[PDB]
Amino acid sequence: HMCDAFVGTWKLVSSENFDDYMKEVGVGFATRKVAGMAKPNMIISVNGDVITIKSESTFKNTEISFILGQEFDEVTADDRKVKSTITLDGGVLVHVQKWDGKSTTIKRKREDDKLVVECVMKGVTSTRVYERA
């Protein structure tokens, strides 16, 4: 019953500061514009110890599967090749991505009926709110 409150299908309903977050990450202009326009659905499932997170939008469809605490290699939607580790910290899913001596963290947390995503790169934070589909 690891991650029960995260499991399901979630749809983006608001975003703040995402363009600036993507700039900080190094995403180029055209990708920022199309990715920032996206209205992704986040689909989270669990089977045993394996968690799967799918993101589907008109921009890109991606899928990761992982075990908490166990690093994996990821190609991100913006085509970075990163080494990722996802853990549960005090009920928050914490996703750290490392590449080229850089690091960014994506936190997913349940707050009321929402799933709130906080993306942090250095001093720039973007907050994205998802609701159940």
Ligand X SMILES: O=C1c2ccc(O)cc2O[C@@H]1C1CCCCC1
Contact residues for ligand X, defined by CB under 6 A: 22, 25, 27, 35, 55, 76-78, 106, 117, 119, 128
- Is 27 annotated in a binding site? The answer is no
Residue 69 CB, nearest approach to ligand X (Å): 19
Q: What is the DSSP letter of 87?
A: E
Q: Give the CB-nearest residue to ligand X.
A: 77
- What is the rounded CA–CA span in Å between residue 7 and residue 129? 16
The residue among 43 and 46 lying less far from ligand X, judged by its C-beta, is 43
Provide the angle, in degrees to the nearest 10, between the axes of the packed helices 18-25 and 29-37.
Answer: 140
Residues 60 and 69: their CA atoms lie apart, in Å, by: 26
Instruction: Compute the least distance from the CB of residue 90 to ligand X, in Å.
Output: 20
User: Residues marked as binding?
Assistant: 128-130
